[PDB]
Design a protein around this ligand. Structure first.
Ligand SMILES: [Zn+2]
Ligand SMILES: [Zn+2]
Ligand SMILES: [Zn+2]
Ligand SMILES: [Zn+2]
Ligand SMILES: [Zn+2]
Ligand SMILES: [Zn+2]
Lengths: 91, 91
């Protein structure tokens, strides 16, 4: 599984590099031909408004799509995550 | 496709019956044996905090799981949706 491991590692690394991201909670990706399609959920400050959270999703989209050009489609959305959360999964 | 059509119709109807839901934006469901597994994204007020949005996700979970007992697992999260949004899909 190294091909998709390396892709998912790079997606997570790029998304955690965006300020406002509190970990990656869910991520699934797949190849379609040579291209990649992915769905991701990031953790964010629960006190952010949803509008504010979205601006983090858009930053993550930009960062990830920009660092990994084989990604043809990427959907990013958010869930709440408190600091020191052990209630949700993460990478 | 009537079996899954009827299930998805019932999921959407039950979720839109929850105050705070601004449409169902994304929904995918499948059978695993006789049981159903689903992933849904609801629209919410962009001005809600993420914490507040989550309380809507938990209400939708409760409503949907309660009305459709063949659903064994259901993940609900949110995205922003302004009133009169034509920028995101919906059911
Ligand atoms: Zn978003
Ligand atoms: Zn956007
Ligand atoms: Zn979406
Ligand atoms: Zn939620
Ligand atoms: Zn919850
Ligand atoms: Zn989740």
């Amino acid at each position: 599984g190294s091909h998709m491991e390396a892709v998912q590692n790079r997606i997570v690394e790029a998304a955690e590099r965006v300020p406002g991201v509190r970990g990656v909670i869910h991520l699934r990706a797949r190849y379609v031909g040579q291209d990649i399609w992915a769905n991701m959920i990031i953790g964010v400050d629960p006190e952010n408004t949803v509008e504010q959270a979205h601006e983090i999703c858009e930053a993550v989209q930009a960062a990830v799509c920009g660092k990994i050009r084989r990604i043809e489609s990427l959907h990013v959305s958010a869930e709440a995550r408190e600091i020191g959360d052990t209630t949700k999964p993460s990478f």
